[PDB]
């Protein structure tokens, strides 16, 4: 069974982008879809779409990369350089609006989960709220 | 107490020309004009690439020996500059430049910083009226720094403020050769100062 | 360890072990010479290091090194110990302090005299 | 030697012998009253109870009992007497007790 | 018995007192109940005696008992002036 589905999805994305897949499926869950919406809005992915596989609900995650490069290993730069779960089961992490970390001096982001809904560190800092520090992306 | 001892030798070791004296360190004498190399037996042999330490060390030594202040005081000042708002490098220079002895040296009341120190020590200098004799006293913006009424007749002070007729003064200062008064307008900036010092290196020396 | 294990067992604080039982966590300790031997170095060194068995006020009878070019320590000398191993002589973990008690300071010493407790020469005379 | 506030110990002894006595009367009479209520002897039991009440309130007058202590005494006394009398099936014959 | 008195706070040869409310049994420099003024015996500065009579008037209204000096200062501050 999946001990932690969020971490799962973040990893599928991590793994798929390291080999440059175009799409990539992750078992569907509202919360997951919520996180994904931020990923898209923040321009980390091309977007996503609800799809059915073997009769079960998944989420095609359309990945995106930089352009082709020069010299050896012309592999594209990543759009998602880093993506790591923070709050995890058996070890939860909650921050107050004044403890929300600033990822890579703002070049990166963080995704909290507040009672005002899933937000990025900025969106959260704005609505002036804190919550479970779900993950850090940059 | 402060250093004491051959000075135009520190100049030699420090490489740069420090003006730890008056008239002479202008004459074609101040050793840097004769033997611009460090003192002692090996002063002339080839020099090995200095270590990062040596570099930072010397830089501090230089900046410090210019104001002829001890390491103790020099250090404390640094820590203060370090603690205030604003670029430590500049700030530090500002505080050193705010020492009474220095300002008296800056106004021409004294030929050299040492001489300035002694002037202050022997109560020949006054700050806003009351006389002050603490070479370490910190002059603030607005203070008028004059020569002692009683002392205004001292040959030396005469000779000095005389040669001052003509000479200009730092843009953070103002001199009234007339009544032998001077005024501390504002804290000099790094741009105002032209010390042969790389403050970045000194800040680093204390990083370690 | 998993975070759960850390909660159950936690980390163990490191304990510091003294290398100088001069008891009373003292800076120095006085005692009396018992034997004032000569000892040979180890591994690659050769010389006749001057050692001394000292019965401390701390109740310990230990071996101490006697620094300097020469000394005046007899069987019941009485002196101050300061601690400091002597790499070449295993077992020797303290130095005797010259210039204190019956331990005369090095004679003729002109340099690092602070150590070797020899007063400043009267050249100033 | 001799710190004249030796007078203090001097006084203390006298004060002690003073309270010591008042408290004995109190105890004694209380028992007396209780013992009677037990017997069922209405009048006399109550009568004695009044002396008891009195000496108690009086001990609290100075510093031999004061306030609560005395209040506690009085309640526990009227308590026991009432009960013992009622149990004995005895009618409160005047004096004391707001029956 | 709570009082309004002076507590030493200067430094050797540089005395500075805090007019204070505290139980008479406290050390003179121990835990007071409330500070209600300050006093510089040597007038080293123009403002060498502040008092906040509002509060003084209160403590006095509740049994506070000033030291002879505390009162002198409280008075000087108009704490008692009824006019």
């Amino acid at each position: 069974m999946l001990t932690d589905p969020i971490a799962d999805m973040l990893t599928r994305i991590r793994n798929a982008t390291r080999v440059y897949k175009e799409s990539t499926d992750v078992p569907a869950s509202r919360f997951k879809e919520e996180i994904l919406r931020i990923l898209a809005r923040e321009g980390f992915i091309k977007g996503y779409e609800r799809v059915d596989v073997d009769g079960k609900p998944y989420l095609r995650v359309y990945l995106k990369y930089g352009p082709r490069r020069q010299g050896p290993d012309p592999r594209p730069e990543q759009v998602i350089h880093h993506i790591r779960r923070i709050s995890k089961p058996g070890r939860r992490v909650y921050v107050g609006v004044k403890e929300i970390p600033r990822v890579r001096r703002g070049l990166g982001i963080a995704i909290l989960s507040t009672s005002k809904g899933v937000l990025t560190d900025r969106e959260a800092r704005k609505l002036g709220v804190g919550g479970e520090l779900i993950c850090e992306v940059w | 107490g402060r250093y004491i001892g051959p000075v135009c030798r520190l100049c030699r070791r420090e490489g740069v020309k420090l003006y730890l004296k008056g008239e002479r360190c202008y004459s074609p004498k101040c050793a840097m004009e004769r033997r611009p190399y460090p003192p002692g037996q090996h002063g002339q042999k080839r020099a090995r690439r200095p270590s990062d330490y040596a570099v930072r060390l010397r830089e501090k030594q230089k900046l410090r020996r210019i104001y002829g202040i001890s390491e103790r005081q020099f250090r404390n000042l640094f820590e203060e500059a370090s603690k205030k708002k604003g670029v430590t490098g500049s700030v530090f220079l500002g505080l050193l430049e705010s020492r009474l002895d220095n300002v008296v040296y800056r106004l021409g009341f004294a030929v050299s910083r040492r001489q300035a120190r002694q002037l202050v020590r022997h109560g020949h200098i006054t700050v806003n009226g009351r006389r002050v004799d603490l070479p370490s006293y910190r002059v603030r913006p607005g203070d008028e720094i004059a020569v002692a009424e009683k002392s205004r007749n001292l040959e030396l002070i005469r000779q000095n403020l005389e040669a001052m007729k003509g000479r200009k003064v730092g843009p953070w200062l103002s001199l009234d050769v007339e009544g032998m008064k001077g005024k501390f307008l504002r804290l000099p900036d790094r741009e105002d100062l032209a010390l042969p010092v790389q403050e970045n290196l000194v800040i680093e020396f204390y990083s370690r | 360890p998993t975070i759960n294990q850390l909660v159950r067992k936690g980390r163990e604080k490191v304990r510091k072990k003294s290398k100088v039982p001069a008891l009373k966590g003292a800076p120095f300790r006085r005692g009396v010479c018992t034997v004032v031997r000569t000892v040979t170095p180890k591994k690659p060194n050769s010389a006749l290091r001057k050692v001394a068995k000292v019965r401390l006020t701390s109740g310990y009878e230990v071996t101490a090194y006697i620094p300097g070019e020469g000394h005046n320590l007899q069987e019941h000398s009485v002196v101050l110990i300061r601690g400091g191993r002597v790499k070449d002589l295993p077992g020797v973990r303290y130095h005797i302090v010259r210039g204190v008690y019956d331990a005369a300071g090095v004679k003729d010493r002109k340099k690092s005299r602070s150590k070797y407790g020899t007063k400043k020469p009267k050249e100033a005379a | 030697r001799n710190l004249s506030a030796l007078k203090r110990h001097r006084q203390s002894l006298k004060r002690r012998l003073r309270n010591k006595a008042k408290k004995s009367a109190i105890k004694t009479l209380s028992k007396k009253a209780v013992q009677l209520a037990q017997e069922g002897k209405a009048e006399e039991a109550l009568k004695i109870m009044r002396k008891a009440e009195s000496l108690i309130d009086k001990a609290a007058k100075g510093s031999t009992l004061h306030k609560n202590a005395a209040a506690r005494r009085k309640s526990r006394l009227m308590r026991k007497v009432r009960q013992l009398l009622e149990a004995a099936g005895a009618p409160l014959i005047g004096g004391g007790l707001s029956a | 018995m709570v009082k309004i008195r002076l507590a030493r706070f200067g430094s050797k040869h540089n005395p500075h007192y805090r007019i204070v409310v505290t139980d008479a049994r406290r050390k003179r420099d121990g835990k007071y109940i409330e500070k209600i003024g300050y006093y510089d015996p040597r007038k080293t500065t123009p403002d060498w005696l502040k008092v906040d009579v509002e509060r003084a008037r209160y403590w006095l209204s509740v049994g506070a008992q000033p030291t002879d000096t505390a009162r002198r200062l409280l008075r000087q501050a108009g704490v008692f002036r009824q006019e």
């Binding site: 058996g90 070890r91 939860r92 992490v93 | - | 975070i3 759960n4 850390l6 909660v7 | - | -």
Partner: protein
């Protein structure tokens, strides 16, 4: 405010007294992970009104006996040994891990 607590009656083996097992969670001061932790209070039950398995509220009270400083305020949800069960088994394991051993 007199402290109010919620726990399960894990023992009605006494006269006018019930043992209430109050539980509480909280972050670990250094490791942060939330950790459960519990305690048993001997609440006063004048009317032997509470039975083994009740989930009662305990109220801070004036000492009743050494050890008794709480009174049963009100019942929250009756019967549920699922909770009592835990407790007893935890207990049962004890007499075991001493000189010889416990169970699975």
């Amino acid at each position: 405010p007199k402290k109010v607590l919620t726990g399960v009656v894990v023992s009605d083996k006494m006269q006018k007294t019930v043992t209430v097992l109050v539980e509480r969670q909280f972050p670990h001061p250094l490791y942060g992970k939330v950790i459960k932790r519990s305690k048993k209070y001997l609440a006063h039950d004048p009317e032997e009104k509470y039975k083994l398995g009740d989930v009662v509220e305990i109220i801070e009270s004036r000492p009743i006996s050494k050890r008794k400083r709480f009174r049963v305020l009100r019942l929250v949800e009756s019967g549920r040994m699922d909770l009592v069960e835990k407790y007893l088994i935890r207990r049962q394991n004890y007499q075991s891990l001493s000189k010889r051993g416990g169970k699975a």
